[PDB]
Subunit: 295 residues, 4 copies
């Protein structure tokens, strides 16, 4: 008999675990692993993809949770739909980071899109996502999607008055090639690469374990864009579960220029984002307002 003939459905036990440490290394998340699907090392970072009984397939970079099959929609829908719905007619989009493809998948739901560029620094992440993370990488096959392997901070500088929307889907500033995507100069390059009525969004971490970088990202973006507003969203497997995103534009206000009918009439599936959540996400708790210097 051969191995395959004798194999049965793999059942989880209490012996294999994934431990993710949060900034500071005093608190973290642990997950049981039924099996490890892939472990790879590029010139940039380490990729691990495994299966958890409750979360499904989990993707991690350098021991930091990037996506889980059960809840990635929460993050990708909030990072992409806010700017996409606010733009009058988004045709050309640039996504920096997001090798898993989730943000690209959400952006592609918008019929106005003619070209979506996914600029990921690590080619191995793209290859691993194409093969093992089909839930998020389904957009790779879209005729309008173009994948570019490059450092986003260097890539965006090559363009001026080119994009309608730029979305930053980066790792933590201290993780991997992240950090390059957090400079004031970088944000200026994004501003210069957008057209006159362009919009922008960037993941700005949890205002809890990563309060430092959250504040810094907001300061730098607000110094470049006339309109800069932080919005929050639940993210059930990210550090603290309280995630922040920063919307920015050259005039379009995230509340005053929001047309709820665009969302009500959307022809694609949305598992988190909706008209009420859009406006609600901009309501900040007092401690967050205090950090940003608002109240």
């Amino acid at each position: 008999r051969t191995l395959k003939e004798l194999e049965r459905e793999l059942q989880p036990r209490q012996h294999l675990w994934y431990f993710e440490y949060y900034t500071g290394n005093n608190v973290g998340l642990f997950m049981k692993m039924n099996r490890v699907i892939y472990s790879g090392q590029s010139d940039i970072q380490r990729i691990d993809i495994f299966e958890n009984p409750d979360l499904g397939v989990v993707f991690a970079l350098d021991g930091i949770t990037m996506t889980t099959e059960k809840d990635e929609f929460m993050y990708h829908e909030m990072l992409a739909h806010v700017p996409m719905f606010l733009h009058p007619n988004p045709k050309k989009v640039l996504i920096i980071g997001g090798g898993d493809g989730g943000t690209l998948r959400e952006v592609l739901k918008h019929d106005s899109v003619e070209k979506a560029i996914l600029c990921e620094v690590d080619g191995l992440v793209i290859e691993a996502a194409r093969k093992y993370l089909k839930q998020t990488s389904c957009g790779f096959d879209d005729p309008r999607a173009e994948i570019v392997i490059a450092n986003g901070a260097e890539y965006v500088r090559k363009f001026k008055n080119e994009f309608d929307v730029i979305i930053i889907d980066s790792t933590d500033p201290t993780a991997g090639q992240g950090g390059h995507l957090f400079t004031e100069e970088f944000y200026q390059a994004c501003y210069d690469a957008l057209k006159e009525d362009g919009v922008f969004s960037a993941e700005t971490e949890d205002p809890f374990y990563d309060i430092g970088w959250f504040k810094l990202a907001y300061r730098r973006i607000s110094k470049v864009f006339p309109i800069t507003r932080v919005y929050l969203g639940f993210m059930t497997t990210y550090p603290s579960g309280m995630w922040s995103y920063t919307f920015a534009s050259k005039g379009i206000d995230p509340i005053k220029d929001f047309d709820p009918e665009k969302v009500r009439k959307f022809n694609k599936e949305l598992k988190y984002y909706n008209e009420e959540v859009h406006v609600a996400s901009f309501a900040l708790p007092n401690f967050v307002k205090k950090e940003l210097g608002l109240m």
Copy 2:
């Protein structure tokens, strides 16, 4: 020994592991020191110090409060129904042995009497001794602390309270479950005055989806107005916590007066007027689980 002791420094050897429902995911925290470990006839109490979260309080290995973020939970559970009530004078809080909810309730000058009904006397005593940050309202003359099963205690009252807040452990944890039956919610309804309001912690709609749904269905079957609101809770399972507001007619949005919150003469670290309204906007997956979509 006393002369030789120095400030205790954290290492990587002592840990607290909190398993979430299902035992497949959990949270881990480094422990610099264990302040107290005690066992009552009901459950086990552990209070320890974590370098980032400060003092941590756990019941049967489940995180109850953290010095760094407990305000997020307590402010949302308490201030939503308190600010919606026209003039809350008499309040009943079931559970909440740590005292956080009582503390928030006491910030409203309108309160003349607030009963804190905790089932475990050991929790009250541990909170008084080690959790000063949340048990600060224990000596307030308006506060009355009683030890009893809230499910039975509430039955002593009819047309008595302006606000009833359920600050309970999980439906499967230490004496909980008594606080999640339809019989219980009806008694809460009966214990409230004609225009009374209500709030109850209804778990995270992620690891504890089952109990979240059941709590909503049971509450909605008793109260004419039943609405779920959400809030961030940085150290609770999933970080997405739900609370269910209920009333005999008062609407959480339609009858909300943002001015009352703006002119509030007390400190609020999470809750505010825009957050109050925003907390009721539910993401699609939550609406779907509740049959609201």
Copy 3:
């Protein structure tokens, strides 16, 4: 550009771990995992094979550590060589369990062996060992080796006055099973069974000894270090129909052995039978 073309040597971090809980679930061993080589489930149990930076390839069954490349020799040499060297001319050997192949590998070092049957209950363990545990399964293809997929307690009762040596590697602990091994051995046959650590598994250690002692006239416990098994103190039980492990031991056979031994030697053979007081007390040997 290509996936394989972008891959580099995998570096160990602090996020993947293997936790082995000991009997009682109050203490255990943890190991960092650089990668998981194989995870599979048979009708009988779960197999996990992974790589640890210090121990090398690690093989676990149902979350219990079975072998480690760094130290498996300690266990396999003590379980196998004590009975093999004590037998005057071991030609036919039966090994029950030992799916990894380690005991089989040690037994095959003895030139007198003509046939060594490896009776493993789970075929998936044999196939996984053949593919991923080359260090221990190297004897699978030896013409003298015969692999049988069967329950050892059922398989052994098919034989009478057949084997010179029987070794029980980690139904296989009943008095009737031991009696079946006794009946399957020749008049001068010898036996060894791994009998656990007299620490976390003291209950089973005592029971195994009692049961073996009710069948074999000569029953003697010996001990050895096993650096990755629970407690590090492992016991083995030698048994026979007359051959004494100390009195009939010939040191010269070991001194002149022409095969590699990384643990076992003539001094260790005799020393392994010296039992600390707490062990003697547990077995009632004063």
Copy 4:
């Protein structure tokens, strides 16, 4: 509060993790409660209760003693040299603040003076209060506790002691520690009388193979007779522990009289005549490491 307290039961939330050299493997233990955590100017002390092992004492997250099995280590470290000496009257023990080695040494009626030289006074104080199983001999009229650095202390003596035993010291400094230098071993040699004997714990020849080889090499450059012996130690890294016996002529096998052990009037839970001799039989890998094949 004490009136409400019941016997504390262990759950699955509190843990102690010990990392072995290399940090790729380690041991974890469940904690029912933490008895004492303290920090001296030298190291951190943690004493807790484990359901199977009883009271556990760890220094800087390295397991030093466990109630269930400390006898294995202390008996082998102390009894081998004690029974080999003709008439041990004056004994010096360096390290071992828990007191176990001292306890075993005191079982020998010939002893008139046994000095326990511990570098950290907090260890002695904590052992008195929380490690009664091992510190029971601290107040024996023949015992003297000295708080000092053993490398400095031993140099104050010449032709003074019958037996010197080096218990655990500075676990975190590894082979580079002050108690593993040729200079220190020479000071020990000089402090011993003409027919003195010596033993030192020399680590596990698995995770700490280098440290083990270094200790043996340095001890052997000083003493004419140097022999490694091994013992089981059920909660130490790898479970295979080594000890190095040394003397100015007394041979551990040629001068061993089993009758002294057989007639011993005190309790021994590990050590006996067969084990004495057997502990000197080294597996091939150990012999190769020491250059004895």
